[PDB]
Amino acid sequence: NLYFQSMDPTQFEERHLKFLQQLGKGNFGSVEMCRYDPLQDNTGEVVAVKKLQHSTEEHLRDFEREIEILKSLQHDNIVKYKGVCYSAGRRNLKLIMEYLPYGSLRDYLQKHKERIDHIKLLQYTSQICKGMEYLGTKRYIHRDLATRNILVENENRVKIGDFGLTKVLPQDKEYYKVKEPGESPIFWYAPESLTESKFSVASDVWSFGVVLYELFTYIEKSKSPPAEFMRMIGNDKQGQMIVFHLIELLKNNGRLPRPDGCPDEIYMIMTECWNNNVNQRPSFRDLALRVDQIRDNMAG
Protein backbone atom coordinates (compact mmCIF):
# COMPACT_ATOMS: atom_id res chain seq x y z
CA ASN A 1 0.00 0.00 0.00
CA LEU A 2 2.20 2.78 1.36
CA TYR A 3 4.73 2.55 -1.50
CA PHE A 4 3.64 1.07 -4.83
CA GLN A 5 5.80 -1.43 -6.70
CA SER A 6 8.72 0.00 -8.64
CA MET A 7 7.93 0.81 -12.27
CA ASP A 8 9.53 3.23 -14.71
CA PRO A 9 6.56 5.04 -16.31
CA THR A 10 8.80 7.58 -18.08
CA GLN A 11 10.93 5.03 -19.94
CA PHE A 12 8.41 4.64 -22.77
CA GLU A 13 6.12 7.66 -22.87
CA GLU A 14 3.10 7.16 -25.10
CA ARG A 15 3.57 10.49 -26.88
CA HIS A 16 6.92 9.29 -28.29
CA LEU A 17 5.83 5.74 -29.19
CA LYS A 18 5.03 5.93 -32.91
CA PHE A 19 3.05 3.30 -34.82
CA LEU A 20 4.83 1.60 -37.72
CA GLN A 21 2.86 -1.59 -38.46
CA GLN A 22 0.38 -4.12 -37.17
CA LEU A 23 2.14 -7.44 -36.57
CA GLY A 24 -0.59 -9.80 -35.40
CA LYS A 25 -3.39 -10.68 -33.02
CA GLY A 26 -3.54 -13.58 -30.56
CA ASN A 27 -6.41 -14.73 -28.39
CA PHE A 28 -6.21 -11.91 -25.84
CA GLY A 29 -3.57 -9.61 -27.36
CA SER A 30 -2.44 -7.60 -30.37
CA VAL A 31 1.13 -6.69 -31.34
CA GLU A 32 2.42 -3.65 -33.21
CA MET A 33 5.75 -2.45 -34.50
CA CYS A 34 6.57 1.02 -33.19
CA ARG A 35 9.47 3.46 -33.12
CA TYR A 36 10.41 5.09 -29.83
CA ASP A 37 11.50 8.61 -30.85
CA PRO A 38 11.96 10.76 -27.73
CA LEU A 39 14.11 13.31 -29.58
CA GLN A 40 11.10 13.71 -31.92
CA ASP A 41 13.49 13.70 -34.89
CA ASN A 42 12.17 10.68 -36.85
CA THR A 43 14.75 8.33 -35.28
CA GLY A 44 14.88 6.01 -32.25
CA GLU A 45 14.82 2.29 -31.64
CA VAL A 46 12.24 0.07 -33.30
CA VAL A 47 10.29 -2.01 -30.79
CA ALA A 48 7.41 -4.45 -30.63
CA VAL A 49 4.43 -3.41 -28.52
CA LYS A 50 1.97 -5.95 -27.11
CA LYS A 51 -1.51 -4.74 -26.18
CA LEU A 52 -4.65 -6.51 -25.13
CA GLN A 53 -7.54 -7.29 -27.48
CA HIS A 54 -10.13 -7.19 -24.66
CA SER A 55 -9.14 -5.16 -21.59
CA THR A 56 -11.13 -6.84 -18.88
CA GLU A 57 -9.88 -6.73 -15.32
CA GLU A 58 -8.89 -10.43 -15.22
CA HIS A 59 -6.94 -10.05 -18.44
CA LEU A 60 -5.05 -7.05 -17.08
CA ARG A 61 -3.97 -9.06 -14.02
CA ASP A 62 -2.76 -11.93 -16.17
CA PHE A 63 -0.97 -9.44 -18.46
CA GLU A 64 0.88 -7.97 -15.47
CA ARG A 65 2.07 -11.48 -14.56
CA GLU A 66 3.20 -12.06 -18.16
CA ILE A 67 5.12 -8.78 -18.11
CA GLU A 68 6.84 -9.71 -14.84
CA ILE A 69 7.73 -13.10 -16.31
CA LEU A 70 9.29 -11.61 -19.45
CA LYS A 71 11.13 -8.91 -17.49
CA SER A 72 12.70 -11.62 -15.30
CA LEU A 73 14.18 -13.39 -18.35
CA GLN A 74 17.51 -12.47 -19.97
CA HIS A 75 18.77 -15.02 -22.50
CA ASP A 76 19.98 -15.04 -26.09
CA ASN A 77 17.00 -17.19 -27.16
CA ILE A 78 14.26 -15.25 -25.31
CA VAL A 79 12.77 -12.10 -26.84
CA LYS A 80 14.25 -9.13 -24.99
CA TYR A 81 12.05 -7.22 -22.56
CA LYS A 82 12.41 -3.44 -22.89
CA GLY A 83 9.79 -1.91 -20.62
CA VAL A 84 6.15 -0.93 -20.27
CA CYS A 85 4.20 1.99 -21.69
CA TYR A 86 1.47 3.27 -19.38
CA SER A 87 -0.63 4.83 -22.12
CA ALA A 88 -4.06 6.49 -22.00
CA GLY A 89 -2.61 8.86 -19.43
CA ARG A 90 -1.31 5.97 -17.30
CA ARG A 91 -4.67 4.16 -17.36
CA ASN A 92 -3.61 1.35 -19.72
CA LEU A 93 -0.63 -0.98 -19.97
CA LYS A 94 1.42 -2.03 -23.01
CA LEU A 95 4.44 -4.33 -23.06
CA ILE A 96 7.55 -3.12 -24.92
CA MET A 97 10.05 -5.63 -26.31
CA GLU A 98 12.74 -5.74 -28.97
CA TYR A 99 11.56 -6.11 -32.57
CA LEU A 100 12.59 -9.26 -34.47
CA PRO A 101 12.24 -8.66 -38.21
CA TYR A 102 11.42 -12.09 -39.66
CA GLY A 103 8.32 -12.75 -37.60
CA SER A 104 7.15 -16.08 -36.34
CA LEU A 105 9.10 -19.20 -37.16
CA ARG A 106 5.86 -20.70 -38.48
CA ASP A 107 5.59 -17.92 -41.05
CA TYR A 108 9.33 -17.86 -41.79
CA LEU A 109 9.38 -21.59 -42.59
CA GLN A 110 6.53 -21.05 -45.09
CA LYS A 111 7.78 -17.77 -46.56
CA HIS A 112 11.57 -18.28 -46.54
CA LYS A 113 12.19 -21.87 -47.56
CA GLU A 114 14.83 -20.55 -49.98
CA ARG A 115 17.16 -20.04 -47.01
CA ILE A 116 16.25 -23.08 -44.86
CA ASP A 117 17.96 -26.47 -44.84
CA HIS A 118 18.36 -29.15 -42.20
CA ILE A 119 21.43 -27.46 -40.70
CA LYS A 120 19.35 -24.36 -40.03
CA LEU A 121 16.48 -26.42 -38.60
CA LEU A 122 18.88 -28.12 -36.17
CA GLN A 123 20.32 -24.74 -35.17
CA TYR A 124 16.84 -23.43 -34.41
CA THR A 125 16.03 -26.66 -32.53
CA SER A 126 19.12 -26.19 -30.37
CA GLN A 127 18.32 -22.54 -29.66
CA ILE A 128 14.75 -23.35 -28.63
CA CYS A 129 16.01 -26.04 -26.29
CA LYS A 130 18.48 -23.61 -24.68
CA GLY A 131 15.79 -20.98 -24.13
CA MET A 132 13.68 -23.68 -22.52
CA GLU A 133 16.56 -24.83 -20.30
CA TYR A 134 16.69 -21.24 -19.08
CA LEU A 135 12.93 -21.12 -18.40
CA GLY A 136 13.27 -24.26 -16.30
CA THR A 137 15.85 -22.57 -14.06
CA LYS A 138 13.13 -20.04 -13.20
CA ARG A 139 10.55 -22.83 -12.68
CA TYR A 140 8.45 -21.37 -15.50
CA ILE A 141 6.23 -23.62 -17.62
CA HIS A 142 5.65 -22.09 -21.03
CA ARG A 143 2.48 -24.08 -21.93
CA ASP A 144 2.31 -22.84 -25.53
CA LEU A 145 5.51 -23.93 -27.22
CA ALA A 146 4.76 -23.94 -30.96
CA THR A 147 6.48 -22.42 -33.98
CA ARG A 148 3.88 -19.62 -34.04
CA ASN A 149 5.32 -18.44 -30.69
CA ILE A 150 8.98 -18.57 -31.72
CA LEU A 151 10.35 -15.47 -33.44
CA VAL A 152 13.12 -15.13 -36.01
CA GLU A 153 15.77 -12.43 -35.59
CA ASN A 154 17.82 -13.52 -38.63
CA GLU A 155 18.68 -16.71 -40.47
CA ASN A 156 20.93 -17.74 -37.56
CA ARG A 157 18.89 -16.80 -34.47
CA VAL A 158 15.45 -17.56 -33.12
CA LYS A 159 13.95 -16.62 -29.77
CA ILE A 160 10.95 -17.74 -27.75
CA GLY A 161 8.73 -14.75 -28.41
CA ASP A 162 5.57 -14.95 -26.32
CA PHE A 163 4.70 -15.88 -22.70
CA GLY A 164 0.93 -15.27 -22.39
CA LEU A 165 0.19 -18.77 -21.06
CA THR A 166 3.33 -19.18 -18.94
CA LYS A 167 2.87 -20.29 -15.32
CA VAL A 168 5.23 -20.43 -12.34
CA LEU A 169 5.47 -23.77 -10.59
CA PRO A 170 4.33 -23.81 -6.95
CA GLN A 171 7.25 -24.02 -4.55
CA ASP A 172 6.50 -27.60 -3.50
CA LYS A 173 5.24 -29.20 -6.74
CA GLU A 174 6.76 -30.13 -10.10
CA TYR A 175 3.55 -29.40 -11.96
CA TYR A 176 1.05 -26.55 -12.21
CA LYS A 177 -2.62 -27.57 -12.35
CA VAL A 178 -4.43 -24.97 -14.44
CA LYS A 179 -7.83 -24.38 -12.83
CA GLU A 180 -9.31 -21.72 -15.10
CA PRO A 181 -8.60 -22.98 -18.63
CA GLY A 182 -9.31 -20.76 -21.59
CA GLU A 183 -8.57 -21.61 -25.21
CA SER A 184 -6.17 -24.57 -25.25
CA PRO A 185 -3.72 -25.51 -28.05
CA ILE A 186 -4.81 -29.13 -27.77
CA PHE A 187 -2.73 -30.48 -30.67
CA TRP A 188 0.47 -29.48 -28.84
CA TYR A 189 -0.65 -30.79 -25.43
CA ALA A 190 0.79 -33.74 -23.56
CA PRO A 191 -1.77 -36.39 -22.58
CA GLU A 192 -1.68 -35.50 -18.88
CA SER A 193 -2.35 -31.87 -19.80
CA LEU A 194 -5.39 -32.96 -21.81
CA THR A 195 -6.71 -35.31 -19.12
CA GLU A 196 -5.64 -33.66 -15.85
CA SER A 197 -4.76 -30.03 -16.74
CA LYS A 198 -1.25 -30.73 -15.40
CA PHE A 199 1.61 -28.73 -16.89
CA SER A 200 5.28 -29.23 -16.16
CA VAL A 201 8.71 -29.00 -17.68
CA ALA A 202 7.99 -32.46 -19.09
CA SER A 203 4.80 -31.29 -20.81
CA ASP A 204 6.83 -28.47 -22.35
CA VAL A 205 9.18 -31.21 -23.61
CA TRP A 206 6.19 -32.99 -25.20
CA SER A 207 5.22 -29.76 -26.95
CA PHE A 208 8.84 -29.26 -28.02
CA GLY A 209 8.55 -32.61 -29.79
CA VAL A 210 5.64 -31.14 -31.75
CA VAL A 211 7.75 -28.04 -32.52
CA LEU A 212 10.47 -30.31 -33.91
CA TYR A 213 7.83 -32.03 -36.05
CA GLU A 214 6.65 -28.62 -37.28
CA LEU A 215 10.17 -27.63 -38.27
CA PHE A 216 10.70 -30.75 -40.39
CA THR A 217 7.29 -30.55 -42.10
CA TYR A 218 8.48 -27.09 -43.30
CA ILE A 219 4.93 -25.91 -42.53
CA GLU A 220 3.78 -27.88 -45.56
CA LYS A 221 0.10 -27.57 -46.38
CA SER A 222 -1.81 -30.54 -44.95
CA LYS A 223 1.10 -31.47 -42.67
CA SER A 224 0.45 -29.22 -39.66
CA PRO A 225 -0.25 -30.95 -36.32
CA PRO A 226 -3.96 -29.99 -36.41
CA ALA A 227 -4.40 -31.21 -39.99
CA GLU A 228 -2.54 -34.47 -39.36
CA PHE A 229 -4.29 -35.28 -36.10
CA MET A 230 -7.66 -34.48 -37.71
CA ARG A 231 -6.84 -36.82 -40.60
CA MET A 232 -6.00 -39.57 -38.11
CA ILE A 233 -9.10 -38.92 -35.95
CA GLY A 234 -11.49 -38.38 -38.85
CA ASN A 235 -11.81 -35.05 -40.60
CA ASP A 236 -15.58 -34.86 -40.10
CA LYS A 237 -15.37 -34.88 -36.31
CA GLN A 238 -16.44 -31.73 -34.49
CA GLY A 239 -16.45 -30.37 -30.96
CA GLN A 240 -15.62 -32.49 -27.95
CA MET A 241 -15.52 -35.64 -30.07
CA ILE A 242 -12.22 -34.31 -31.40
CA VAL A 243 -10.79 -34.11 -27.88
CA PHE A 244 -12.12 -37.54 -26.90
CA HIS A 245 -10.51 -39.16 -29.93
CA LEU A 246 -7.26 -37.20 -29.57
CA ILE A 247 -6.89 -38.35 -25.97
CA GLU A 248 -7.70 -41.98 -26.82
CA LEU A 249 -5.30 -41.91 -29.79
CA LEU A 250 -2.41 -40.46 -27.78
CA LYS A 251 -2.93 -42.75 -24.78
CA ASN A 252 -2.51 -45.78 -27.06
CA ASN A 253 0.56 -44.56 -28.92
CA GLY A 254 -0.92 -42.79 -31.93
CA ARG A 255 1.54 -40.17 -33.08
CA LEU A 256 2.24 -37.69 -35.81
CA PRO A 257 4.11 -39.37 -38.70
CA ARG A 258 7.74 -38.89 -39.62
CA PRO A 259 7.85 -35.88 -41.98
CA ASP A 260 9.00 -36.49 -45.52
CA GLY A 261 12.78 -36.17 -45.62
CA CYS A 262 13.16 -36.18 -41.85
CA PRO A 263 16.14 -38.26 -40.68
CA ASP A 264 15.27 -41.28 -38.55
CA GLU A 265 17.44 -39.91 -35.75
CA ILE A 266 15.49 -36.63 -35.59
CA TYR A 267 12.18 -38.52 -35.65
CA MET A 268 13.55 -40.59 -32.76
CA ILE A 269 14.01 -37.38 -30.75
CA MET A 270 10.40 -36.47 -31.48
CA THR A 271 9.10 -39.86 -30.37
CA GLU A 272 11.17 -39.80 -27.16
CA CYS A 273 9.65 -36.41 -26.31
CA TRP A 274 6.21 -37.93 -26.96
CA ASN A 275 6.41 -40.46 -24.12
CA ASN A 276 3.21 -40.95 -22.16
CA ASN A 277 5.45 -41.67 -19.16
CA VAL A 278 6.19 -38.14 -17.98
CA ASN A 279 9.40 -39.00 -16.11
CA GLN A 280 10.89 -40.84 -19.13
CA ARG A 281 10.82 -37.77 -21.38
CA PRO A 282 14.32 -36.30 -21.91
CA SER A 283 15.26 -33.00 -20.33
CA PHE A 284 15.88 -29.86 -22.34
CA ARG A 285 19.55 -30.16 -21.35
CA ASP A 286 19.64 -33.71 -22.74
CA LEU A 287 18.02 -32.47 -25.94
CA ALA A 288 20.30 -29.48 -26.50
CA LEU A 289 23.37 -31.67 -26.04
CA ARG A 290 22.07 -34.40 -28.36
CA VAL A 291 21.09 -31.92 -31.07
CA ASP A 292 24.39 -30.05 -30.82
CA GLN A 293 26.30 -33.35 -31.00
CA ILE A 294 24.37 -34.31 -34.15
CA ARG A 295 25.24 -30.93 -35.65
CA ASP A 296 28.88 -31.14 -34.58
CA ASN A 297 29.34 -34.71 -35.82
CA MET A 298 28.62 -33.65 -39.39
CA ALA A 299 31.65 -33.16 -41.60
CA GLY A 300 33.27 -29.74 -41.19
Ligand SMILES: N#CCNC(=O)c1ccc(-c2ccnc(Nc3ccc(N4CCOCC4)cc3)n2)cc1
Ligand atom coordinates in the same frame (compact mmCIF):
# COMPACT_ATOMS: atom_id res chain seq x y z
N1 LIG B 1 -1.35 -11.55 -28.36
C1 LIG B 1 -0.66 -12.42 -28.59
C2 LIG B 1 0.27 -13.60 -28.91
N2 LIG B 1 1.57 -13.06 -29.24
C3 LIG B 1 1.74 -12.43 -30.52
O1 LIG B 1 0.86 -12.37 -31.31
C4 LIG B 1 3.10 -11.84 -30.80
C5 LIG B 1 4.10 -11.80 -29.83
C6 LIG B 1 5.33 -11.23 -30.12
C7 LIG B 1 5.51 -10.65 -31.36
C8 LIG B 1 6.83 -10.03 -31.78
C9 LIG B 1 7.82 -9.60 -30.94
C10 LIG B 1 8.97 -9.10 -31.46
N3 LIG B 1 9.12 -9.03 -32.78
C11 LIG B 1 8.11 -9.45 -33.57
N4 LIG B 1 8.30 -9.33 -34.98
C12 LIG B 1 7.36 -9.69 -36.01
C13 LIG B 1 7.80 -9.41 -37.29
C14 LIG B 1 7.01 -9.74 -38.37
C15 LIG B 1 5.77 -10.32 -38.15
N5 LIG B 1 4.92 -10.70 -39.26
C16 LIG B 1 5.53 -10.55 -40.54
C17 LIG B 1 4.65 -11.15 -41.63
O2 LIG B 1 3.32 -10.63 -41.58
C18 LIG B 1 2.73 -10.82 -40.30
C19 LIG B 1 3.58 -10.23 -39.17
C20 LIG B 1 5.35 -10.61 -36.87
C21 LIG B 1 6.13 -10.29 -35.79
N6 LIG B 1 6.98 -9.94 -33.06
C22 LIG B 1 4.52 -10.72 -32.33
C23 LIG B 1 3.30 -11.29 -32.04
